């Protein structure tokens, strides 16, 4: 397995960036997974944005805290290769994991949500322990959608030797810390966002600026402009993690 | 000028990293600044921590949230080139800024602390406005000690054209987004930590994992092991920001 | 001067409860102040809800975090006896305080917002310092809209001997701790909510239950039912705070 | 059955109030339960603290967030009738429930901890469902130690008709809202704390005021002075919750 992991797809520039560049590189990977938490004009996922991702070559789409902004998501969750955080409570729509099959090899993908500085949910560590006991595969990729670097690092060491790779998202800025932990698991704190960086985490500068300055609510406004494609490549060969490499593409 | 900014010096490994390597590249810079908020066994700063950094070639040390862990910091704040967050309220020991002087040129260094997911402090945006209104220099470097990426980015844009460069700390992971904002101000979300990465943000893996698994307090133990020196180089010339470059060195 | 303070007016039952009962006891007071943060269907204040409050016999209306929920508030803020939290940043619409005149005697009303478990606003302690320094009156009433009971008690003690009384809001639950501080200042942790208690914090029980059980988004729905009028009577005389008495009236 | 539930015993004063008064009214109740997470100098519980509580007439002691401040607590958790929140992770020391018995009738007492504005723990709602299936008793008393009133109420309604009574703690201020829910379950937002009220939630006024003004750490210090004994009387007859009444005692 040759896997491409694509950093948070941010609003219209992000979706455009994927649609435009993925086709030119899809051939380089066996499987492509992407976080599409903000794919629907910045907030969530809808049928349209899902389609453009799939049509661009994405095989599986993960969500996050915004996983419920749009109704259409519930249809995507029951019949499409779309997953939400594993560690929502029982009775939650959709699945918290997915099994990808390619070339006779299997890859178990799992997204989990951190709890520090975020909403209360089930314990990510033990939810992972249980899952990994019931679902076996050639490779296991765990995406940790969290705010705290310590929580992301805690989960990764905890997963060392069990997961083939642990990639973080949510923070929107790509980190220069791609490495392999003592027991072999690959790791990166944040993949980064795929969208226009001529903004503040996807939103229009002055909008966010107005929030910090006035202390008064300011409706989200997706920024528009040239985008950056952010992703991380994972090389899984012979049931063992081989290499991890961040990837960047600047839209012309 | 040519300035080197060194990412949070974390406990004994971080201190060794600076003492062992800084001497070797010291002559390539006019000014060397370092965040020493975790220099003392991972918590705050004390006289020994301070002397070591100085002996290595550090010209100025900044703090943050752990600034008040050791009473020895007061003497330091009182008569040494050590600074604390500008945006503490009136009646706070020490200074929140420092105007360095070298070969006839001046560099105003200021550290502000974010408020999102952190303690309630004064408005850093307007705190900076008041300072920059009365304090002038050839160049200005602002360190933003904050948790949220949106807050660091908001502060950078808000200072764009006024500050020569804006660097983020507190996260402990180097980000790959060193760039030049519209009005010329250089920026990087997080310089990264200086210390052993065989840990959880400098803390012993076993210790942090226990906190996360049990939800019960666990006294902080500083991880020990090979270190990584993390810094960011800045080039200011002709009264303008020329370049910004993430720097790394692995301890043999 | 005999003052009535009315606990958070919650959505339609709250507006009703006041419109019904206040006219029957208005005689008993010289001045009446109300928190209308949740007046307009539980979220904010607008022309209609405001008008209903004045007609019921309210002389001044205060808000809080939900102040900006309806843009109709702005007009109200610049021409009507409506005040928002004092500690918002410079340039914030509306006044942070208001002077009430009743038979020669003057009453300075001030609303302050806590920062613990809330948003990063200006320092409320020093904010009051600057105000009470440049604004005098026979009596001073400070409302503390905050979440943490420690912050309310600290603000109260800090104002002891300065404010005639300090009353807390935001909790939506009446507290039984009305008393006199060491230096005379009257105090109660939370006045209580004015609206239907057949709900959770004024919202439908089911909606809120769904939020805690699913961890997923649930739009706010104002509960309906018998209202329970909550307020606190303040007796200031001879320039000195004499009494404080919580008041309750259940809708028949 | 007549049960007396004492509010959080705060340090020396609180501990004194219980020892002096409880022996006087002890005969007026069948079971006496007390929150003692602040009994030992305002920081957790210990042998001395526990002995004094038992010798005072307390049959069971509950804990909370500070349950782990003292090493001696673990031994108490193993043999003595002391409980910590049920909603900690599996493998946690001690129990989160306790079966009391008095002449034929049985009482299941449970303590859960809220999560809003607090630490990440297991889902208290579903934790209660599971416990209530395996543990049955004539009456059930659930203590909700939390910050958010909305969470305490949501839990109360979730237990309505299932729990005999639901009492909240952690806020340190008695609420005037004791009542009966639609399905008979008795409820009160906060029993209030037992200790000297001439302080900010049990702590020295000056100390807490210093924290709020400086924004710098100040070691906790328990206030000393005349105490207020806060509790709530519960009456369970014919297999249903009959009466709930707040209870106060000013120290001579
Ligand atoms: Co490991
Ligand atoms: Co997110
Ligand atoms: Co991201
Ligand atoms: Co290429
Ligand atoms: Co070199
Ligand atoms: Co700009
Ligand atoms: Co820090
Ligand atoms: Co009447
Ligand atoms: Co005082
Ligand atoms: Co409010
Ligand atoms: Co019910
Ligand atoms: Co507590
Ligand atoms: Co309490």
mmCIF file of N, CA and C in Angstrom, chain A residues 52-150:
data_model
loop_
_atom_site.group_PDB
_atom_site.id
_atom_site.type_symbol
_atom_site.label_atom_id
_atom_site.label_comp_id
_atom_site.label_asym_id
_atom_site.label_seq_id
_atom_site.Cartn_x
_atom_site.Cartn_y
_atom_site.Cartn_z
ATOM 1 N N UNK A 52 -17.946 15.722 -5.949
ATOM 2 C CA UNK A 52 -16.738 16.280 -6.538
ATOM 3 C C UNK A 52 -15.479 15.637 -5.939
ATOM 4 N N UNK A 53 -15.528 15.289 -4.658
ATOM 5 C CA UNK A 53 -14.374 14.650 -4.033
ATOM 6 C C UNK A 53 -14.179 13.256 -4.639
ATOM 7 N N UNK A 54 -15.243 12.462 -4.641
ATOM 8 C CA UNK A 54 -15.202 11.113 -5.198
ATOM 9 C C UNK A 54 -14.766 11.126 -6.661
ATOM 10 N N UNK A 55 -15.370 12.024 -7.437
ATOM 11 C CA UNK A 55 -15.066 12.159 -8.854
ATOM 12 C C UNK A 55 -13.644 12.627 -9.096
ATOM 13 N N UNK A 56 -12.996 13.141 -8.055
ATOM 14 C CA UNK A 56 -11.632 13.617 -8.195
ATOM 15 C C UNK A 56 -10.659 12.486 -7.897
ATOM 16 N N UNK A 57 -11.169 11.411 -7.308
ATOM 17 C CA UNK A 57 -10.313 10.281 -6.997
ATOM 18 C C UNK A 57 -10.228 9.921 -5.523
ATOM 19 N N UNK A 58 -11.018 10.589 -4.688
ATOM 20 C CA UNK A 58 -11.009 10.296 -3.260
ATOM 21 C C UNK A 58 -11.857 9.049 -3.022
ATOM 22 N N UNK A 59 -11.314 8.102 -2.262
ATOM 23 C CA UNK A 59 -11.997 6.843 -1.966
ATOM 24 C C UNK A 59 -12.819 6.842 -0.681
ATOM 25 N N UNK A 60 -12.432 7.674 0.281
ATOM 26 C CA UNK A 60 -13.122 7.736 1.569
ATOM 27 C C UNK A 60 -13.013 9.138 2.162
ATOM 28 N N UNK A 61 -14.123 9.621 2.711
ATOM 29 C CA UNK A 61 -14.159 10.948 3.301
ATOM 30 C C UNK A 61 -14.509 10.895 4.789
ATOM 31 N N UNK A 62 -13.708 11.581 5.601
ATOM 32 C CA UNK A 62 -13.931 11.646 7.049
ATOM 33 C C UNK A 62 -14.527 13.014 7.414
ATOM 34 N N UNK A 63 -15.158 13.106 8.582
ATOM 35 C CA UNK A 63 -15.775 14.359 9.001
ATOM 36 C C UNK A 63 -15.077 15.046 10.180
ATOM 37 N N UNK A 64 -15.806 15.213 11.279
ATOM 38 C CA UNK A 64 -15.245 15.859 12.450
ATOM 39 C C UNK A 64 -16.350 16.476 13.286
ATOM 40 N N UNK A 65 -16.053 17.591 13.949
ATOM 41 C CA UNK A 65 -17.045 18.257 14.786
ATOM 42 C C UNK A 65 -18.184 18.879 13.977
ATOM 43 N N UNK A 66 -17.914 19.223 12.720
ATOM 44 C CA UNK A 66 -18.922 19.829 11.843
ATOM 45 C C UNK A 66 -19.701 18.798 11.029
ATOM 46 N N UNK A 67 -19.443 17.525 11.302
ATOM 47 C CA UNK A 67 -20.075 16.415 10.596
ATOM 48 C C UNK A 67 -21.593 16.468 10.455
ATOM 49 N N UNK A 68 -22.252 17.369 11.174
ATOM 50 C CA UNK A 68 -23.706 17.406 11.126
ATOM 51 C C UNK A 68 -24.353 18.686 10.631
ATOM 52 N N UNK A 69 -23.556 19.622 10.129
ATOM 53 C CA UNK A 69 -24.098 20.889 9.644
ATOM 54 C C UNK A 69 -25.237 20.748 8.626
ATOM 55 N N UNK A 70 -25.084 19.831 7.673
ATOM 56 C CA UNK A 70 -26.100 19.624 6.643
ATOM 57 C C UNK A 70 -26.851 18.305 6.764
ATOM 58 N N UNK A 71 -28.126 18.340 6.396
ATOM 59 C CA UNK A 71 -28.991 17.173 6.450
ATOM 60 C C UNK A 71 -28.462 16.045 5.565
ATOM 61 N N UNK A 72 -28.254 16.360 4.289
ATOM 62 C CA UNK A 72 -27.769 15.410 3.295
ATOM 63 C C UNK A 72 -26.703 14.438 3.793
ATOM 64 N N UNK A 73 -25.978 14.829 4.833
ATOM 65 C CA UNK A 73 -24.922 13.990 5.376
ATOM 66 C C UNK A 73 -25.445 12.638 5.847
ATOM 67 N N UNK A 74 -26.673 12.607 6.355
ATOM 68 C CA UNK A 74 -27.233 11.358 6.862
ATOM 69 C C UNK A 74 -27.446 10.288 5.796
ATOM 70 N N UNK A 75 -27.656 10.697 4.552
ATOM 71 C CA UNK A 75 -27.822 9.729 3.472
ATOM 72 C C UNK A 75 -26.426 9.216 3.108
ATOM 73 N N UNK A 76 -25.462 10.133 3.089
ATOM 74 C CA UNK A 76 -24.075 9.801 2.765
ATOM 75 C C UNK A 76 -23.493 8.837 3.802
ATOM 76 N N UNK A 77 -23.887 9.031 5.060
ATOM 77 C CA UNK A 77 -23.408 8.208 6.165
ATOM 78 C C UNK A 77 -23.917 6.770 6.154
ATOM 79 N N UNK A 78 -25.122 6.550 5.649
ATOM 80 C CA UNK A 78 -25.642 5.197 5.643
ATOM 81 C C UNK A 78 -25.309 4.376 4.401
ATOM 82 N N UNK A 79 -24.969 5.028 3.292
ATOM 83 C CA UNK A 79 -24.683 4.281 2.074
ATOM 84 C C UNK A 79 -23.397 4.609 1.329
ATOM 85 N N UNK A 80 -22.635 5.585 1.802
ATOM 86 C CA UNK A 80 -21.408 5.962 1.105
ATOM 87 C C UNK A 80 -20.166 5.791 1.950
ATOM 88 N N UNK A 81 -18.985 5.794 1.310
ATOM 89 C CA UNK A 81 -17.714 5.654 2.025
ATOM 90 C C UNK A 81 -17.373 6.991 2.707
ATOM 91 N N UNK A 82 -18.130 7.285 3.764
ATOM 92 C CA UNK A 82 -17.991 8.495 4.574
ATOM 93 C C UNK A 82 -18.063 8.055 6.031
ATOM 94 N N UNK A 83 -17.132 8.525 6.846
ATOM 95 C CA UNK A 83 -17.122 8.153 8.250
ATOM 96 C C UNK A 83 -17.116 9.354 9.181
ATOM 97 N N UNK A 84 -17.630 9.150 10.389
ATOM 98 C CA UNK A 84 -17.639 10.200 11.401
ATOM 99 C C UNK A 84 -16.797 9.727 12.583
ATOM 100 N N UNK A 85 -16.519 10.605 13.549
ATOM 101 C CA UNK A 85 -15.699 10.149 14.677
ATOM 102 C C UNK A 85 -16.241 8.904 15.380
ATOM 103 N N UNK A 86 -15.361 7.916 15.558
ATOM 104 C CA UNK A 86 -15.672 6.645 16.218
ATOM 105 C C UNK A 86 -16.207 6.934 17.610
ATOM 106 N N UNK A 87 -15.601 7.970 18.161
ATOM 107 C CA UNK A 87 -16.011 8.063 19.549
ATOM 108 C C UNK A 87 -17.180 8.980 19.937
ATOM 109 N N UNK A 88 -18.131 9.093 19.015
ATOM 110 C CA UNK A 88 -19.479 9.504 19.404
ATOM 111 C C UNK A 88 -20.190 8.385 20.172
ATOM 112 N N UNK A 89 -21.224 8.734 20.953
ATOM 113 C CA UNK A 89 -21.944 7.714 21.720
ATOM 114 C C UNK A 89 -22.748 6.714 20.898
ATOM 115 N N UNK A 90 -23.125 5.590 21.517
ATOM 116 C CA UNK A 90 -23.909 4.580 20.804
ATOM 117 C C UNK A 90 -25.154 5.248 20.206
ATOM 118 N N UNK A 91 -25.690 4.670 19.136
ATOM 119 C CA UNK A 91 -26.867 5.248 18.505
ATOM 120 C C UNK A 91 -26.566 6.383 17.538
ATOM 121 N N UNK A 92 -25.289 6.713 17.368
ATOM 122 C CA UNK A 92 -24.900 7.781 16.457
ATOM 123 C C UNK A 92 -24.929 7.287 15.018
ATOM 124 N N UNK A 93 -25.513 8.089 14.113
ATOM 125 C CA UNK A 93 -25.602 7.740 12.692
ATOM 126 C C UNK A 93 -24.224 7.545 12.063
ATOM 127 N N UNK A 94 -24.179 6.772 10.984
ATOM 128 C CA UNK A 94 -22.924 6.546 10.294
ATOM 129 C C UNK A 94 -22.008 5.605 11.035
ATOM 130 N N UNK A 95 -20.807 5.428 10.502
ATOM 131 C CA UNK A 95 -19.833 4.531 11.092
ATOM 132 C C UNK A 95 -18.590 5.302 11.495
ATOM 133 N N UNK A 96 -17.902 4.801 12.514
ATOM 134 C CA UNK A 96 -16.698 5.454 12.987
ATOM 135 C C UNK A 96 -15.448 4.879 12.361
ATOM 136 N N UNK A 97 -15.622 3.934 11.444
ATOM 137 C CA UNK A 97 -14.480 3.317 10.783
ATOM 138 C C UNK A 97 -14.880 2.728 9.446
ATOM 139 N N UNK A 98 -13.885 2.458 8.614
ATOM 140 C CA UNK A 98 -14.138 1.883 7.303
ATOM 141 C C UNK A 98 -13.004 0.948 6.915
ATOM 142 N N UNK A 99 -13.346 -0.087 6.160
ATOM 143 C CA UNK A 99 -12.368 -1.056 5.695
ATOM 144 C C UNK A 99 -12.168 -0.870 4.201
ATOM 145 N N UNK A 100 -10.953 -0.525 3.796
ATOM 146 C CA UNK A 100 -10.667 -0.349 2.380
ATOM 147 C C UNK A 100 -9.917 -1.581 1.910
ATOM 148 N N UNK A 101 -10.240 -2.022 0.702
ATOM 149 C CA UNK A 101 -9.618 -3.195 0.111
ATOM 150 C C UNK A 101 -9.006 -2.800 -1.226
ATOM 151 N N UNK A 102 -7.729 -3.100 -1.404
ATOM 152 C CA UNK A 102 -7.069 -2.770 -2.653
ATOM 153 C C UNK A 102 -5.876 -3.700 -2.870
ATOM 154 N N UNK A 103 -5.874 -4.399 -4.005
ATOM 155 C CA UNK A 103 -4.789 -5.316 -4.322
ATOM 156 C C UNK A 103 -4.731 -6.514 -3.390
ATOM 157 N N UNK A 104 -5.887 -6.925 -2.884
ATOM 158 C CA UNK A 104 -5.920 -8.053 -1.975
ATOM 159 C C UNK A 104 -5.534 -7.664 -0.554
ATOM 160 N N UNK A 105 -5.025 -6.447 -0.376
ATOM 161 C CA UNK A 105 -4.639 -5.969 0.948
ATOM 162 C C UNK A 105 -5.752 -5.125 1.547
ATOM 163 N N UNK A 106 -5.810 -5.096 2.875
ATOM 164 C CA UNK A 106 -6.838 -4.339 3.576
ATOM 165 C C UNK A 106 -6.269 -3.210 4.432
ATOM 166 N N UNK A 107 -7.018 -2.116 4.503
ATOM 167 C CA UNK A 107 -6.629 -0.958 5.297
ATOM 168 C C UNK A 107 -7.818 -0.534 6.137
ATOM 169 N N UNK A 108 -7.643 -0.533 7.450
ATOM 170 C CA UNK A 108 -8.710 -0.111 8.333
ATOM 171 C C UNK A 108 -8.515 1.364 8.629
ATOM 172 N N UNK A 109 -9.476 2.194 8.238
ATOM 173 C CA UNK A 109 -9.361 3.616 8.540
ATOM 174 C C UNK A 109 -10.248 3.952 9.725
ATOM 175 N N UNK A 110 -9.732 4.791 10.619
ATOM 176 C CA UNK A 110 -10.484 5.190 11.799
ATOM 177 C C UNK A 110 -10.232 6.637 12.187
ATOM 178 N N UNK A 111 -11.304 7.389 12.356
ATOM 179 C CA UNK A 111 -11.174 8.765 12.791
ATOM 180 C C UNK A 111 -11.684 8.829 14.219
ATOM 181 N N UNK A 112 -11.004 9.610 15.041
ATOM 182 C CA UNK A 112 -11.387 9.759 16.432
ATOM 183 C C UNK A 112 -11.280 11.247 16.745
ATOM 184 N N UNK A 113 -12.077 11.718 17.697
ATOM 185 C CA UNK A 113 -12.063 13.125 18.057
ATOM 186 C C UNK A 113 -11.455 13.339 19.434
ATOM 187 N N UNK A 114 -10.579 14.328 19.560
ATOM 188 C CA UNK A 114 -9.996 14.591 20.865
ATOM 189 C C UNK A 114 -11.044 15.222 21.765
ATOM 190 N N UNK A 115 -10.767 15.307 23.061
ATOM 191 C CA UNK A 115 -11.724 15.921 23.975
ATOM 192 C C UNK A 115 -11.188 17.190 24.642
ATOM 193 N N UNK A 116 -9.866 17.358 24.682
ATOM 194 C CA UNK A 116 -9.304 18.561 25.300
ATOM 195 C C UNK A 116 -9.671 19.786 24.461
ATOM 196 N N UNK A 117 -10.210 20.810 25.114
ATOM 197 C CA UNK A 117 -10.630 22.038 24.444
ATOM 198 C C UNK A 117 -11.731 21.790 23.432
ATOM 199 N N UNK A 118 -12.380 20.632 23.532
ATOM 200 C CA UNK A 118 -13.464 20.292 22.625
ATOM 201 C C UNK A 118 -14.670 19.779 23.398
ATOM 202 N N UNK A 119 -15.671 19.298 22.675
ATOM 203 C CA UNK A 119 -16.889 18.804 23.301
ATOM 204 C C UNK A 119 -16.700 17.461 23.985
ATOM 205 N N UNK A 120 -17.479 17.204 25.041
ATOM 206 C CA UNK A 120 -17.369 15.932 25.761
ATOM 207 C C UNK A 120 -17.884 14.801 24.872
ATOM 208 N N UNK A 121 -17.118 13.728 24.767
ATOM 209 C CA UNK A 121 -17.518 12.572 23.975
ATOM 210 C C UNK A 121 -16.923 11.366 24.675
ATOM 211 N N UNK A 122 -17.075 10.190 24.083
ATOM 212 C CA UNK A 122 -16.525 9.002 24.699
ATOM 213 C C UNK A 122 -14.997 9.037 24.615
ATOM 214 N N UNK A 123 -14.362 8.290 25.512
ATOM 215 C CA UNK A 123 -12.906 8.180 25.590
ATOM 216 C C UNK A 123 -12.328 7.597 24.277
ATOM 217 N N UNK A 124 -11.510 8.385 23.565
ATOM 218 C CA UNK A 124 -10.891 7.971 22.299
ATOM 219 C C UNK A 124 -9.955 6.768 22.443
ATOM 220 N N UNK A 125 -9.168 6.757 23.514
ATOM 221 C CA UNK A 125 -8.215 5.669 23.759
ATOM 222 C C UNK A 125 -8.879 4.303 23.872
ATOM 223 N N UNK A 126 -9.870 4.186 24.750
ATOM 224 C CA UNK A 126 -10.533 2.894 24.917
ATOM 225 C C UNK A 126 -11.459 2.538 23.753
ATOM 226 N N UNK A 127 -11.986 3.544 23.062
ATOM 227 C CA UNK A 127 -12.835 3.268 21.907
ATOM 228 C C UNK A 127 -11.915 2.624 20.860
ATOM 229 N N UNK A 128 -10.697 3.144 20.759
ATOM 230 C CA UNK A 128 -9.730 2.604 19.816
ATOM 231 C C UNK A 128 -9.330 1.178 20.223
ATOM 232 N N UNK A 129 -9.071 0.961 21.511
ATOM 233 C CA UNK A 129 -8.682 -0.372 21.970
ATOM 234 C C UNK A 129 -9.703 -1.426 21.553
ATOM 235 N N UNK A 130 -10.977 -1.130 21.777
ATOM 236 C CA UNK A 130 -12.036 -2.057 21.432
ATOM 237 C C UNK A 130 -12.081 -2.297 19.927
ATOM 238 N N UNK A 131 -12.133 -1.223 19.142
ATOM 239 C CA UNK A 131 -12.183 -1.362 17.692
ATOM 240 C C UNK A 131 -11.047 -2.237 17.184
ATOM 241 N N UNK A 132 -9.814 -1.848 17.492
ATOM 242 C CA UNK A 132 -8.652 -2.606 17.051
ATOM 243 C C UNK A 132 -8.666 -4.067 17.482
ATOM 244 N N UNK A 133 -9.489 -4.416 18.467
ATOM 245 C CA UNK A 133 -9.557 -5.814 18.885
ATOM 246 C C UNK A 133 -10.525 -6.560 17.967
ATOM 247 N N UNK A 134 -11.621 -5.904 17.586
ATOM 248 C CA UNK A 134 -12.598 -6.544 16.718
ATOM 249 C C UNK A 134 -12.336 -6.437 15.206
ATOM 250 N N UNK A 135 -11.693 -5.364 14.757
ATOM 251 C CA UNK A 135 -11.414 -5.206 13.330
ATOM 252 C C UNK A 135 -9.927 -5.341 12.999
ATOM 253 N N UNK A 136 -9.568 -6.446 12.352
ATOM 254 C CA UNK A 136 -8.181 -6.694 11.974
ATOM 255 C C UNK A 136 -7.970 -6.335 10.511
ATOM 256 N N UNK A 137 -6.750 -5.961 10.161
ATOM 257 C CA UNK A 137 -6.468 -5.586 8.791
ATOM 258 C C UNK A 137 -4.973 -5.598 8.522
ATOM 259 N N UNK A 138 -4.601 -5.503 7.250
ATOM 260 C CA UNK A 138 -3.189 -5.473 6.895
ATOM 261 C C UNK A 138 -2.597 -4.177 7.447
ATOM 262 N N UNK A 139 -3.327 -3.076 7.282
ATOM 263 C CA UNK A 139 -2.863 -1.775 7.771
ATOM 264 C C UNK A 139 -3.954 -1.008 8.501
ATOM 265 N N UNK A 140 -3.543 -0.186 9.464
ATOM 266 C CA UNK A 140 -4.489 0.622 10.231
ATOM 267 C C UNK A 140 -4.090 2.096 10.247
ATOM 268 N N UNK A 141 -4.920 2.950 9.651
ATOM 269 C CA UNK A 141 -4.639 4.379 9.673
ATOM 270 C C UNK A 141 -5.639 5.029 10.619
ATOM 271 N N UNK A 142 -5.126 5.753 11.604
ATOM 272 C CA UNK A 142 -5.992 6.435 12.544
ATOM 273 C C UNK A 142 -5.842 7.946 12.384
ATOM 274 N N UNK A 143 -6.949 8.632 12.138
ATOM 275 C CA UNK A 143 -6.900 10.081 12.039
ATOM 276 C C UNK A 143 -7.375 10.623 13.391
ATOM 277 N N UNK A 144 -6.591 11.499 14.011
ATOM 278 C CA UNK A 144 -6.990 12.089 15.288
ATOM 279 C C UNK A 144 -7.339 13.558 15.054
ATOM 280 N N UNK A 145 -8.631 13.857 15.129
ATOM 281 C CA UNK A 145 -9.142 15.205 14.898
ATOM 282 C C UNK A 145 -9.201 15.918 16.249
ATOM 283 N N UNK A 146 -8.131 16.617 16.595
ATOM 284 C CA UNK A 146 -8.062 17.266 17.900
ATOM 285 C C UNK A 146 -7.401 18.633 17.930
ATOM 286 N N UNK A 147 -7.578 19.325 19.052
ATOM 287 C CA UNK A 147 -6.986 20.646 19.233
ATOM 288 C C UNK A 147 -5.631 20.575 19.936
ATOM 289 N N UNK A 148 -5.546 19.729 20.954
ATOM 290 C CA UNK A 148 -4.334 19.619 21.750
ATOM 291 C C UNK A 148 -3.261 18.691 21.209
ATOM 292 N N UNK A 149 -2.064 19.235 21.045
ATOM 293 C CA UNK A 149 -0.941 18.452 20.558
ATOM 294 C C UNK A 149 -0.635 17.304 21.532
ATOM 295 N N UNK A 150 -0.781 17.550 22.831
ATOM 296 C CA UNK A 150 -0.509 16.505 23.814
ATOM 297 C C UNK A 150 -1.473 15.330 23.662
#
